[model samples]
Target: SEFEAVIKVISSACKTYCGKTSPSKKEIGAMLSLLQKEGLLMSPSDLYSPGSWDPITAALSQRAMILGKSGELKTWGLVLGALKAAREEQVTSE
Candidate 1:
């Protein structure tokens, strides 16, 4: 169920960003870095490759444990919101 939740959250965020062209690993890492600096409290180093399920899942799982239920949901919401905003800007610019 943990992995399922992880996949769902990631898939939804990816879909919001770009359904056809997914974000690069570096891009995701950058976002993670921003989140960290913003007090999202995640380790940027945990990310290996955005395209790989293992790294994403591992990082999110660790975050889930560290953040607890409400904190995890809040962080996910923040990430999704930022991703959605970026997606909209990307679409509008093109």
Candidate 2:
């Protein structure tokens, strides 16, 4: 169930920030920028060509693991929480 939770968090964040089921390059770029600013530095190669949710989810999960292994999981949560908050704002604004 832990793996599922990870996937859910990543997917939910993507959906909220991008505001679409299938995000465009621009949307993904924006999400990446926000995440980086939040201190979740993902490799550009890991995220460059995310054609759909699968790739994005995989990349995010892998990155999460890397952060966790390095004792930076809290930073990961901070980024995730930021995205969630942004999503909530979008929902309330609309």
Candidate 3:
């Protein structure tokens, strides 16, 4: 039962994620720009690519805080994505 409950939690989370709405592009871009200024942003493409950002981790952290906060999570995703992109850039830059 505990296992089932865990499964349900994850399952519901996935469903919620799938059904969740994303934030506005303009807003997301603004947030990412802010991150970029902070030296947290890596590349512009990070906002578009999948698996480039720590999507799962950031999503979970945000979902806990917002329970469906829109633009913020996408912004967070962009930040994480930028961070990932920056890491890759560093590998290449050097």
Candidate 1's residue-wise lDDT over 1-94, tens digit each?
4333444455456667546555444444454554455553344432223333334445556666877533433444444554556656778999
**Worst 10-residue lDDT window, candidate 1:** 45-54
Model 2: per-residue Cα lDDT over 27-50, one tens digit each: 444555544554444543332232
| Residue 38 error, candidate 3, Å | 1.0
- Residue 46: error of model 2 in Å? 8.8
Task: Write down the lDDT of every candidate, Cα atoms only.
Answer: 0.48, 0.46, 0.47
| Model 2 misplaced regions, further than 4 Å | 1-70
**Model 3 whole-model lDDT (C-alpha atoms):** 0.47
- The count of residue-pair clashes in candidate 1 stands at 0
Once model 2 is optimally superposed onto the true structure by TM-score, how far is the C-alpha of residue 92 displaced, in angstroms?
A: 1.1
Worst 10 residues of 3 by lDDT: 2-11
lDDT of 2 at 43: 47
Cα lDDT of model 3 by residue, 45-83, tens digit: 444354535544554465558665455555455444444
TM-score of each: 0.30, 0.30, 0.33
